Short mmCIF file of all heavy atoms in Angstrom, two decimals:
data_model
loop_
_atom_site.label_atom_id
_atom_site.label_comp_id
_atom_site.label_asym_id
_atom_site.label_seq_id
_atom_site.Cartn_x
_atom_site.Cartn_y
_atom_site.Cartn_z
N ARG A 1 -68.02 -28.19 39.68
CA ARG A 1 -67.31 -28.75 38.55
C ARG A 1 -66.98 -30.22 38.81
O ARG A 1 -67.23 -31.05 37.96
CB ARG A 1 -66.04 -27.94 38.26
CG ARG A 1 -65.37 -28.32 36.92
CD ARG A 1 -64.21 -27.41 36.57
NE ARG A 1 -64.60 -26.00 36.55
CZ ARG A 1 -64.27 -25.11 37.49
NH1 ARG A 1 -63.64 -25.47 38.60
NH2 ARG A 1 -64.56 -23.83 37.30
N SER A 2 -66.44 -30.52 40.00
CA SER A 2 -66.15 -31.89 40.39
C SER A 2 -67.41 -32.75 40.36
O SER A 2 -67.38 -33.87 39.87
CB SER A 2 -65.53 -31.96 41.78
OG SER A 2 -64.32 -31.23 41.83
N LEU A 3 -68.51 -32.21 40.91
CA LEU A 3 -69.78 -32.92 40.95
C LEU A 3 -70.28 -33.30 39.56
O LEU A 3 -70.68 -34.43 39.34
CB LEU A 3 -70.84 -32.07 41.68
CG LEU A 3 -72.27 -32.61 41.67
CD1 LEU A 3 -72.35 -33.87 42.49
CD2 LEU A 3 -73.24 -31.57 42.18
N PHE A 4 -70.27 -32.34 38.63
CA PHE A 4 -70.78 -32.60 37.29
C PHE A 4 -69.87 -33.51 36.47
O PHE A 4 -70.36 -34.35 35.72
CB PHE A 4 -70.98 -31.29 36.55
CG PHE A 4 -72.02 -30.36 37.14
CD1 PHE A 4 -71.99 -29.01 36.86
CD2 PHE A 4 -73.00 -30.84 38.00
CE1 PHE A 4 -72.93 -28.16 37.41
CE2 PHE A 4 -73.95 -29.98 38.53
CZ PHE A 4 -73.91 -28.65 38.23
N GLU A 5 -68.56 -33.34 36.62
CA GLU A 5 -67.60 -34.12 35.85
C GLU A 5 -67.42 -35.54 36.39
O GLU A 5 -67.24 -36.48 35.62
CB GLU A 5 -66.22 -33.42 35.84
CG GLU A 5 -66.17 -32.16 34.99
CD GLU A 5 -64.86 -31.41 35.06
OE1 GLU A 5 -63.92 -31.90 35.72
OE2 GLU A 5 -64.78 -30.29 34.49
N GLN A 6 -67.48 -35.69 37.72
CA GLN A 6 -67.07 -36.93 38.37
C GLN A 6 -68.06 -37.51 39.39
O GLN A 6 -67.85 -38.61 39.89
CB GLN A 6 -65.74 -36.69 39.09
CG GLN A 6 -64.62 -36.22 38.18
CD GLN A 6 -63.34 -36.00 38.96
OE1 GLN A 6 -63.13 -34.95 39.56
NE2 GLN A 6 -62.43 -36.99 38.91
N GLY A 7 -69.11 -36.75 39.72
CA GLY A 7 -70.10 -37.19 40.69
C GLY A 7 -69.82 -36.69 42.10
O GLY A 7 -68.79 -36.08 42.39
N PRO A 8 -70.74 -36.99 43.05
CA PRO A 8 -70.69 -36.40 44.38
C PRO A 8 -69.53 -36.88 45.26
O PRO A 8 -69.14 -36.19 46.19
CB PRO A 8 -72.05 -36.81 44.97
CG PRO A 8 -72.39 -38.08 44.27
CD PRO A 8 -71.85 -37.95 42.88
N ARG A 9 -68.88 -37.99 44.87
CA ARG A 9 -67.73 -38.56 45.65
C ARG A 9 -66.49 -37.66 45.64
O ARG A 9 -65.63 -37.86 46.50
CB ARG A 9 -67.33 -39.94 45.11
CG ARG A 9 -67.64 -40.17 43.63
CD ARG A 9 -66.43 -40.12 42.71
NE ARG A 9 -65.31 -40.96 43.11
CZ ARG A 9 -65.15 -42.25 42.81
NH1 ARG A 9 -66.07 -42.89 42.11
NH2 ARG A 9 -64.08 -42.89 43.24
N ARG A 10 -66.40 -36.72 44.71
CA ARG A 10 -65.20 -35.84 44.59
C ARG A 10 -65.42 -34.53 45.36
O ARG A 10 -64.49 -33.73 45.45
CB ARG A 10 -64.90 -35.62 43.10
CG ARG A 10 -63.49 -35.14 42.79
CD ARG A 10 -62.38 -35.68 43.68
NE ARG A 10 -62.18 -37.12 43.63
CZ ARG A 10 -61.16 -37.75 44.21
NH1 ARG A 10 -60.25 -37.05 44.86
NH2 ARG A 10 -61.05 -39.06 44.12
N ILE A 11 -66.61 -34.35 45.93
CA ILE A 11 -66.91 -33.13 46.75
C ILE A 11 -66.06 -33.20 48.02
O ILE A 11 -65.98 -34.28 48.62
CB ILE A 11 -68.43 -33.02 47.02
CG1 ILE A 11 -69.22 -32.83 45.73
CG2 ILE A 11 -68.72 -31.91 48.02
CD1 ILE A 11 -70.71 -32.83 45.92
N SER A 12 -65.44 -32.09 48.41
CA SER A 12 -64.63 -32.06 49.62
C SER A 12 -65.44 -32.31 50.90
O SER A 12 -66.52 -31.75 51.05
CB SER A 12 -63.91 -30.73 49.75
OG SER A 12 -63.23 -30.66 51.00
N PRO A 13 -64.92 -33.09 51.87
CA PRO A 13 -65.53 -33.18 53.20
C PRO A 13 -65.62 -31.85 53.94
O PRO A 13 -66.45 -31.68 54.84
CB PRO A 13 -64.62 -34.15 53.96
CG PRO A 13 -63.86 -34.91 52.88
CD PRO A 13 -63.74 -33.96 51.72
N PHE A 14 -64.75 -30.91 53.56
CA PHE A 14 -64.72 -29.58 54.15
C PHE A 14 -65.56 -28.57 53.38
O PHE A 14 -65.57 -27.39 53.74
CB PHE A 14 -63.27 -29.08 54.26
CG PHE A 14 -62.46 -29.95 55.18
CD1 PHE A 14 -61.55 -30.86 54.68
CD2 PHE A 14 -62.65 -29.90 56.56
CE1 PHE A 14 -60.83 -31.69 55.53
CE2 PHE A 14 -61.93 -30.73 57.41
CZ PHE A 14 -61.02 -31.62 56.89
N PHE A 15 -66.27 -29.02 52.33
CA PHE A 15 -66.98 -28.09 51.47
C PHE A 15 -67.98 -27.22 52.25
O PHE A 15 -67.98 -26.00 52.10
CB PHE A 15 -67.69 -28.84 50.34
CG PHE A 15 -68.73 -28.02 49.63
CD1 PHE A 15 -68.40 -26.80 49.07
CD2 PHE A 15 -70.03 -28.47 49.53
CE1 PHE A 15 -69.36 -26.03 48.44
CE2 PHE A 15 -70.99 -27.70 48.87
CZ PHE A 15 -70.64 -26.49 48.32
N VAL A 16 -68.83 -27.83 53.07
CA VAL A 16 -69.85 -27.06 53.75
C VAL A 16 -69.24 -26.09 54.78
O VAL A 16 -69.42 -24.87 54.66
CB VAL A 16 -70.99 -27.92 54.37
CG1 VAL A 16 -71.97 -27.04 55.14
CG2 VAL A 16 -71.72 -28.70 53.28
N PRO A 17 -68.48 -26.56 55.79
CA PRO A 17 -67.95 -25.63 56.80
C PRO A 17 -66.94 -24.62 56.26
O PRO A 17 -66.78 -23.55 56.84
CB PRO A 17 -67.33 -26.57 57.85
CG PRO A 17 -67.03 -27.82 57.12
CD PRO A 17 -68.14 -27.96 56.08
N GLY A 18 -66.31 -24.94 55.12
CA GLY A 18 -65.33 -24.07 54.50
C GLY A 18 -65.93 -23.09 53.50
O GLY A 18 -65.20 -22.33 52.86
N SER A 19 -67.27 -23.09 53.36
CA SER A 19 -67.93 -22.25 52.37
C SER A 19 -69.08 -21.40 52.90
O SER A 19 -69.46 -20.42 52.27
CB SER A 19 -68.44 -23.09 51.21
OG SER A 19 -67.40 -23.85 50.64
N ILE A 20 -69.64 -21.75 54.07
CA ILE A 20 -70.82 -21.05 54.56
C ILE A 20 -70.44 -19.73 55.25
O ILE A 20 -69.35 -19.59 55.82
CB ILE A 20 -71.74 -21.96 55.45
CG1 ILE A 20 -71.05 -22.40 56.71
CG2 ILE A 20 -72.29 -23.14 54.65
CD1 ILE A 20 -71.89 -23.29 57.62
N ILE A 21 -71.35 -18.76 55.19
CA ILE A 21 -71.01 -17.39 55.53
C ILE A 21 -70.63 -17.16 56.99
O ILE A 21 -69.81 -16.28 57.27
CB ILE A 21 -72.17 -16.45 55.07
CG1 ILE A 21 -72.24 -16.41 53.56
CG2 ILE A 21 -72.01 -15.05 55.65
CD1 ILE A 21 -73.48 -15.72 52.98
N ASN A 22 -71.18 -17.95 57.91
CA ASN A 22 -70.96 -17.69 59.35
C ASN A 22 -69.62 -18.26 59.85
O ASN A 22 -69.37 -18.16 61.03
CB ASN A 22 -72.08 -18.27 60.20
CG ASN A 22 -72.14 -19.78 60.16
OD1 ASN A 22 -72.20 -20.37 59.09
ND2 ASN A 22 -72.14 -20.42 61.32
N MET A 23 -68.81 -18.79 58.94
CA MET A 23 -67.57 -19.47 59.41
C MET A 23 -66.42 -18.47 59.64
O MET A 23 -65.42 -18.88 60.22
CB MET A 23 -67.21 -20.66 58.53
CG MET A 23 -68.25 -21.75 58.63
SD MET A 23 -68.57 -22.37 60.31
CE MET A 23 -66.91 -22.71 60.87
N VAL A 24 -66.53 -17.23 59.17
CA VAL A 24 -65.56 -16.23 59.64
C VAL A 24 -65.72 -16.05 61.15
O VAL A 24 -64.78 -16.24 61.92
CB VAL A 24 -65.64 -14.88 58.88
CG1 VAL A 24 -64.66 -13.86 59.46
CG2 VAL A 24 -65.39 -15.09 57.40
N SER A 25 -66.96 -15.78 61.57
CA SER A 25 -67.30 -15.72 62.98
C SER A 25 -66.95 -17.02 63.70
O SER A 25 -66.32 -17.01 64.78
CB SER A 25 -68.77 -15.40 63.16
OG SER A 25 -69.03 -14.08 62.68
N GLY A 26 -67.32 -18.15 63.10
CA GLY A 26 -67.03 -19.45 63.68
C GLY A 26 -65.53 -19.69 63.89
O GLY A 26 -65.07 -19.92 65.00
N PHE A 27 -64.74 -19.61 62.81
CA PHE A 27 -63.31 -19.89 62.91
C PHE A 27 -62.58 -18.88 63.78
O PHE A 27 -61.69 -19.26 64.54
CB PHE A 27 -62.66 -20.01 61.52
CG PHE A 27 -62.94 -21.36 60.89
CD1 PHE A 27 -63.72 -21.46 59.74
CD2 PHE A 27 -62.49 -22.53 61.48
CE1 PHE A 27 -63.99 -22.70 59.18
CE2 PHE A 27 -62.79 -23.77 60.93
CZ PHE A 27 -63.54 -23.85 59.78
N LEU A 28 -62.95 -17.59 63.68
CA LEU A 28 -62.32 -16.59 64.53
C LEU A 28 -62.54 -16.91 66.00
O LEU A 28 -61.61 -16.83 66.81
CB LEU A 28 -62.84 -15.17 64.27
CG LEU A 28 -62.06 -14.08 65.00
CD1 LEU A 28 -60.70 -13.94 64.43
CD2 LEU A 28 -62.78 -12.79 64.93
N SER A 29 -63.78 -17.28 66.35
CA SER A 29 -64.09 -17.60 67.74
C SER A 29 -63.28 -18.79 68.22
O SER A 29 -62.78 -18.79 69.36
CB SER A 29 -65.57 -17.83 67.94
OG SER A 29 -65.98 -19.11 67.50
N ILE A 30 -63.12 -19.79 67.35
CA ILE A 30 -62.35 -20.97 67.71
C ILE A 30 -60.88 -20.61 67.91
O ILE A 30 -60.27 -21.04 68.90
CB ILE A 30 -62.51 -22.10 66.67
CG1 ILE A 30 -63.97 -22.56 66.59
CG2 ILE A 30 -61.59 -23.27 66.98
CD1 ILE A 30 -64.31 -23.35 65.33
N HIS A 31 -60.32 -19.81 66.99
CA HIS A 31 -58.89 -19.50 67.03
C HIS A 31 -58.53 -18.64 68.24
O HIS A 31 -57.44 -18.80 68.80
CB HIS A 31 -58.43 -18.82 65.73
CG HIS A 31 -58.15 -19.77 64.62
ND1 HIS A 31 -57.04 -20.59 64.52
CD2 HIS A 31 -58.89 -20.02 63.52
CE1 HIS A 31 -57.13 -21.31 63.41
NE2 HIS A 31 -58.24 -20.97 62.78
N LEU A 32 -59.41 -17.70 68.61
CA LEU A 32 -59.13 -16.76 69.69
C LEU A 32 -59.80 -17.08 71.03
O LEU A 32 -59.52 -16.43 72.04
CB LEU A 32 -59.52 -15.37 69.20
CG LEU A 32 -58.66 -14.81 68.05
CD1 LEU A 32 -59.09 -13.39 67.73
CD2 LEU A 32 -57.16 -14.88 68.36
#
């Protein structure tokens, strides 16, 4: 929605690591 309304500059810097499927495994491993 941000991309279409406002362009790629409004995309979050955390979009990729905060959305990809392996980050449950990733973040859990980091936290523990």
Side-chain angles (χ1 to χ4, degrees):
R1 190 173 305 106
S2 301
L3 174 67
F4 296 158
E5 288 175 5
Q6 302 180 277
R9 27 105 51 86
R10 199 35 63 172
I11 297 175
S12 174
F14 297 104
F15 165 56
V16 176
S19 305
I20 64 180
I21 292 170
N22 66 306
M23 294 304 310
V24 177
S25 295
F27 282 114
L28 188 69
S29 78
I30 298 162
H31 278 286
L32 293 184

